C-alpha cells in the first residue's frame, strides 16, 4: 500500500506538487476571510435547562443591553459631576457619537441624561463624593457576535470623549480584549516562534533546502486548513479559539511530520539508493509512520464530539483538518519535492559530529537496560505523586480575571465594581412557564418566591426577604407573555452554585407552571456536568482507538498497551502540575496571571491534545525499534538502534512544537497559557523522561514479549495493506 504509493508519487511527482499546492494556496486566500465569520459562544450545553431558561427569558422579557458598555466619566481638575458646564460638554460628545453611529448604538443612558432625578438606581450611577458617574451604552445587534462587532466600530471615538478620560468596561470591552489576545498571540508567533523554528530546522539538516521543506509543508497545511474551516462556517458556526489551535498544534506537528520524511530520505541517499527508491522507502517507513501518527491524533479528537459544547466541536474540526492535511502533504507535496530535487536537497548550505550523538544515545540506553528497575521505579512513583494535586480541581467561567491583573480593560471593570457596587450581578433565574398559556397569578409568583427563601446563600443587599427574588426587568423588545414570569437572585458565594442550583431545582413549582433554573452560574454548572458525564465514555473510546492504531503501525499487542500506560502517566502528571500552577497559583507572579477555577470544556481539550501528542511521539520512536527488530535483531539491539536512529529527530521534533507553545504561554488569555503550558510540559516529559529512560527500561524487562502478537491478528493487519513494518531486498 505504502510501497505502491511510494513509486506512484515519483511517477506523478510534477502534478501532485502542482495540484496539491494549488488547493493549499487556494484555501489560503479563501481563508483570509475566516476571521470575519467566527463566533464567541459555545461554552454551554445548548440542550440544557439553563440555556432553555435563557431562550425563554429573552423571548418574553427581552434581551438586556444595559451591561453592553459601562463608561466611567471623571471630570478634570477635581471638578464635581454637578458642574453644569462639564455636563453640557460631555453630553454633546456622547450625543455626537450616537448621531454618527445610529446603526451601531441604540443610545446612552445615565444620570447625565437627567441630573435632577428621583430614581434611586439612576442616582446611584454617581459616587457619594460627586467625583465619578457612569453611563450605559446599549448596542445594536441580534446576537452576541453582531453586538461585539458594533462596539469595535465606536470604541476609538468613544474613547476620545472627555479629553480621553473615559474608562470602558462591561461585556463588550472585555470580549474585545479577550478575543484580541488571539491576534497578540499570532503576531508573537510570526516574529518570535517562526524565526526560532527556522534555526532549529537548520541544526538538524545543515542545508537550507532540506530545512525549508518542513516549514513549507507546515505553511501549506495551515493555509489549506484555514480554508477548510471557512467552508465549515458556511454551514455551522466556528469559534475564535479554533484559529490559534491550527497555529499552536497543526503548524507544530505538521513540521514534525515533514521532518521524518526528509530525514529518512537523506538517510536512504547516504546508504546509496537512487531518488525513486529513496522516496518509496520513506513512504513505507516515515510516510507510513506519519499517516498513522495523524490518524491517531484524529482518534484522539473525535470523542470530543460526544461533548455538547460547540467550542469543543469547532476545535476538533480544526485539529482533524490540520493533522490530516499535514500527513497528506507529507506523502504528496513533500514526497514529490524530494523526488524532483533528490540529493540536491543538501546542495546550498548556510553560506547561501552527527555520529557522536547517535553513539551517546546507544550508551545511555545500554545503561538503562543494564539496571532498568533503578530507572523505572523512581520515575513512575514520582509521576504518581505529581497526579496528587489534581484532587484540588475547581471549575468556573469567563470573567475579567482571564486577563493579566495589569490589563487596563480588566482594571476599568474592577474600578466600576468598587465605585458602583450592586450593578454587577450573576443571578440564578427561576423561569416560570404555564402550559395553559394563561397568565401567571401574583400568588403563583409569591408562592415560588417563598420556596426560594427556604434556600440560604442568596444575596440580600437591602436586608429584607421581601425584596429578594425580584422579577427580571422587561425590555421593550420582549413579548410580555403573562404565561411566563421569571424571578432571579444572586449568590453570596459562587462556590455554592452547584449546591444551590440543585436546591432550587428541587423546589416543587406551583401546580400548573414549570420552572427552569438559569443564569450564568447555572450555564457554567451544566456545561461542567455535561463534560464529566461523558468524560469516561470519551476516555474509553480515546484509549481503545489509539491503541489499535499502534497495533497496526507496529506489529505488537503489548507495545500499544505499554504506550497507553506511559501516555496516561504523562497525562495525569501534566494535568496535576497545571492544577498546581493555574489553580493553586504556583507560577502566577512570574508569568503574570491570576489563579482561578478552570474552564471545564478546556480540560477535555487538553486531555485530547496531550494524549494524541504523547502517542505520536511513541510512534516515532518504536517505529524504528520494530523496524530494526523485523530485521532479526535482538530486543536490546532493536531498542538501542530504535532510540539512536531517531533520538535526534524526536528531540528536534519536540523543540519546534515547544517553541510555538512557548509563544502562547505569554498570552494575556489565561486559558491559552493553560493549553500552551500543557503542551510544553508533556513534550518535555515525553521527549526526556519517557523516551530516554522509561521506554528502554520497561521494554528491556519485557524482552521478546515486546514484539508479540497473536497470529490471527497479524494477518488482518497484513490483509489491509498495513504490514510494511519491514523493508524489501533492493540493490543500491
Ligand atoms: C434587564 C434584564 C436583566 C437580565 C437579568 C440580569 C442579568 C445580569 C445583569 C447585571 C449586569 C452584569 C451581567 C453580566 C452577565 C453576563 C455574563 C456572560 O454573558 O458571560 C460572558 C462573560 O462574562 C463577563 O465577561 C462579565 C463582564 C462584566 C459583566 C457585568 C458588567 C457590569 C455592568 C452593569 C451595568 C448595568 C446597569 C445599567 C442600568 C441603568 C439604567 C461570556 O459569554 P460568552 O459565552 O458569550 O463568551 C465569552 C466572552 N465573554
Ligand atoms: C483520561 C482521563 C479520564 C478521567 C475520568 C474522570 C471521571 C470523572 C471525574 C469526576 C466526575 C465528577 O465531576 C465533578 O463535577 C463537579 C461539579 O461541581 C465538580 O465540582 C467541582 O467543580 C464545580 C464547579 O466549580 C463545583 O462542584 C466545585 O468547583 C468543585 O466541587 C467536581 O470537582 C467533579 O468531580
UniProtKB/Swiss-Prot annotation:
Positions of the record's site feature: Part of the proton transportation network: 562, 618
Annotated consequence of substituting residue 316 to I: Confers resistance to ICA38
Activity: how regulated: Inhibited by the antimycobacterial compound BM212, a pyrrole derivative. Inhibited by the antitubercular drug SQ109. Inhibited by the adamantyl urea derivative AU1235, the indole carboxamide ICA38 and rimonabant, the antagonist for the cannabinoid receptor CB1. The dissociation constant (Kd) values for SQ109, AU1235, ICA38 and rimonabant are 1.65 uM, 0.29, 0.16 and 29.5, respectively. Inhibitory effects are due to binding of the inhibitors at the proton-transportation channel most likely dissipating the transmembrane electrochemical proton gradient needed for substrate translocation.
Effect noted on mutating residue 543 to P: Binds to SQ109 with a dissociation constant (Kd) value similar to wild-type
Effect of loss of the gene: Cells lacking this gene are not viable. Knockdown or depletion of this gene leads to accummulation of trehalose monomycolate (TMM) and lack of trehalose dimycolate (TDM). Decrease in mycolylation of arabinogalactan (AG). Accumulates MSMEG_5308 protein.
Result of altering residue 40 to R: Binds to SQ109 with a dissociation constant (Kd) value similar to wild-type
Cell compartment(s), UniProt: Cell inner membrane; Cell septum; Cell tip
Record field: transmembrane: 15-35, 197-217, 218-238, 241-261, 291-311, 318-338, 373-393, 539-559, 563-583, 602-622, 650-670, 675-695
Sorted UniProt keywords: Cell inner membrane, Cell membrane, Cell wall biogenesis/degradation, Lipid transport, Membrane, Transmembrane, Transmembrane helix, Transport
Membrane topology of the entry: Multi-pass membrane protein
Cytoplasmic side: 1-14, 262-290, 560-562, 623-649
Biotechnology: This protein is a target of small molecules which can be validated by developed assays that measure the topology of trehalose monomycolate (TMM) in the inner membrane of mycobacterial spheroplasts after which they may be developed to future antituberculosis drugs. Designing improved inhibitors against this protein could be achieved by avoiding direct contacts with the identified residues that can mutate to confer drug resistance.
Record annotation: effect of changing residue 657 to V: Binds to SQ109, AU1235, ICA38 and rimonabant with a dissociation constant (Kd) value similar to wild-type
Recorded consequence of changing residue 293 to A: Growth defect in both liquid and solid media; confers resistance to SQ109 and AU1235 with 4-fold and 33-fold increased resistance, respectively; disrupted membrane potential; no significant difference in cell wall hydrophobicity; more sensitive to ampicillin and the hydrophobic antibiotics, rifampicin and erythromycin, but no change in sensitivity to chloramphenicol or kanamycin, compared to wild-type
GO biological process: cell wall biogenesis; cell wall organization; mycolate cell wall layer assembly; mycolic acid biosynthetic process; phospholipid transport; regulation of membrane potential; response to antibiotic; response to xenobiotic stimulus
One Gene Ontology term, aspect cellular component: cell pole
Molecular function (Gene Ontology), one example: diacylglycerol binding
Family stated for the protein in its record: Belongs to the resistance-nodulation-cell division (RND) (TC 2.A.6) family. MmpL subfamily.
General remark: Binds antitubercular compounds N-(4,4-dimethylcyclohexyl)-4,6-difluoro-1H-indole-2-carboxamide (NITD-349) and 1-((2,3-dihydrobenzo[b][1,4]dioxin-6-yl) methyl)-6',7'-dihydrospiro[piperidine-4,4'-thieno[3,2-c]pyran] (SPIRO) with Kd values of 0.05 uM and 0.8 uM, respectively.
Complex formation: Monomer. Interacts with TtfA (via N-terminus); active trehalose monomycolate (TMM) biosynthesis is not required for the complex formation. Interacts with MSMEG_5308.
Protein task: Transports trehalose monomycolate (TMM) to the cell wall. Flips TMM across the inner membrane. Membrane potential is not required for this function. Transports probably phosphatidylethanolamine (PE) as well. Binds specifically both TMM and PE, but not trehalose dimycolate (TDM). Also binds diacylglycerol (DAG) and other phospholipids, including phosphatidylglycerol (PG), phosphatidylinositol (PI), and cardiolipin (CDL). Contributes to membrane potential, cell wall composition, antibiotic susceptibility and fitness.
Designated name of the protein: Trehalose monomycolate exporter MmpL3
Organism (species): Mycolicibacterium smegmatis (strain ATCC 700084 / mc(2)155) (Mycobacterium smegmatis)
Whole sequence portion shown: 1 to 761 of 1013
